[PDB]
Design a protein around this ligand. Structure first.
Ligand SMILES: *[C@@H]1O[C@H](CO[C@@H]2O[C@@H](C)[C@@H](O)[C@@H](O)[C@@H]2O)[C@@H](O[C@@H]2O[C@H](CO)[C@@H](O)[C@H](O)[C@H]2NC(C)=O)[C@H](O)[C@H]1NC(C)=O
Ligand code: NAG
Ligand code: CA
Ligand code: CA
Ligand code: CA
Ligand code: CA
Ligand code: CA
Lengths: 192, 51
């Protein structure tokens, strides 16, 4: 879970078979680092000094790190704009908040785009898309095989009931659009 | 030949998408086969007022 990453950060996950290479780009990251403090004492005459370790917080600007993952099937991105890619197994790819790109690759994968304007590619196999009746627009591609998009996972919120009432979605697979706020805004549409 | 204007009222909370279509065809008692002259439809862009 990379959910501790902020909005300004990002990850880029690439598959090398069964192994994953994760490139993390953290902008103005905050990191603990250990140095050497120095406390001094005078004892009535010429001074004797000491030192000791000291953990502390600092922001070190731009950081790039390359993590490595093995035997990992599920990844959760941070609050930024992540690019996450899976492999031939069954993966749980979640993007969280931000304009994330999720690609599952082969196999039966489950794909959760989260908030933001997400683009999601399923690949081959039978894939599952989970949606949340949000205000953003999403781009969804299923690929080969029989695929499913589900809108019933989340309970509707209070402001949704206040602004919309008891109306849900207007979905049409010939047009390829799913309108999550019909007749209230025309740009909260998922394209499938 | 007859020429005339037909007036319509557009609701202020209308939902017509971005593209509205009108369809009209003529008919008579003689009941003769339909022809391209009998049918006509034309398409008009739509915009929504925002303040
Ligand atoms: C401005 O909007 C047009 C139209 O968007 C469509 O109609 C709206 C009412 C809303 O329902 C949108 O979700 C619709 O997509 C955009 O033009 C369309 O662009 C898409 C690709 O982006 C294309 O597939 C459509 O054919 C286009 N349709 C028309 C009529 O042009 C246009 O791109 C938007 N402008 C900007 C700058 O985003
Ligand atoms: C006119 O168009 C309507 C469209 O619904 C159709 O039902 C009707 O049969 C048409 N009539 C003629 C005379 O073309
Ligand atoms: Ca994210
Ligand atoms: Ca996969
Ligand atoms: Ca997201
Ligand atoms: Ca897949
Ligand atoms: Ca698929």
């Amino acid at each position: 879970s990379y959910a501790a990453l902020g909005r300004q950060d990002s990850i880029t996950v690439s598959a090398d078979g069964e192994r994953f290479n994760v490139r993390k780009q953290l902008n103005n990251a905050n990191v603990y680092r250990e140095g050497v403090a120095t406390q001094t004492t005078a004892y009535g005459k010429r001074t004797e000094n000491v030192q000791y370790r000291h953990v502390e917080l600092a922001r070190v600007g731009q950081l790039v790190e390359v993590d490595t993952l093995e035997h990992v099937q599920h990844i959760i991105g941070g609050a930024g704009n992540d690019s996450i890619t899976g492999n031939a197994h069954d993966n749980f790819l979640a993007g969280g908040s931000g304009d994330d790109r999720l690609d599952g690759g082969a196999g039966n994968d489950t794909l959760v785009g989260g908030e933001g304007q997400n683009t999601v590619i399923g690949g081959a196999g039978d894939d599952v898309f989970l949606q949340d009746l949000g205000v953003w627009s999403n781009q969804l591609d299923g690929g080969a095989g029989v695929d499913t998009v589900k809108y019933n996972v989340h309970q509707p919120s209070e402001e949704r009931l206040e602004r919309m009432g008891d109306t849900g979605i207007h979905a049409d697979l010939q047009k390829g659009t799913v309108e999550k706020w019909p007749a209230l805004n025309l740009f909260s549409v998922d394209h499938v | 030949e007859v020429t005339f204007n037909i007036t319509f009222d557009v609701d202020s909370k209308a939902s017509l998408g971005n593209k509205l279509l009108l369809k009209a065809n003529v008919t008579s008692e003689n009941n003769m086969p339909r022809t391209n002259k009998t049918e006509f439809q034309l398409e008009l862009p739509v915009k929504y007022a925002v303040y």
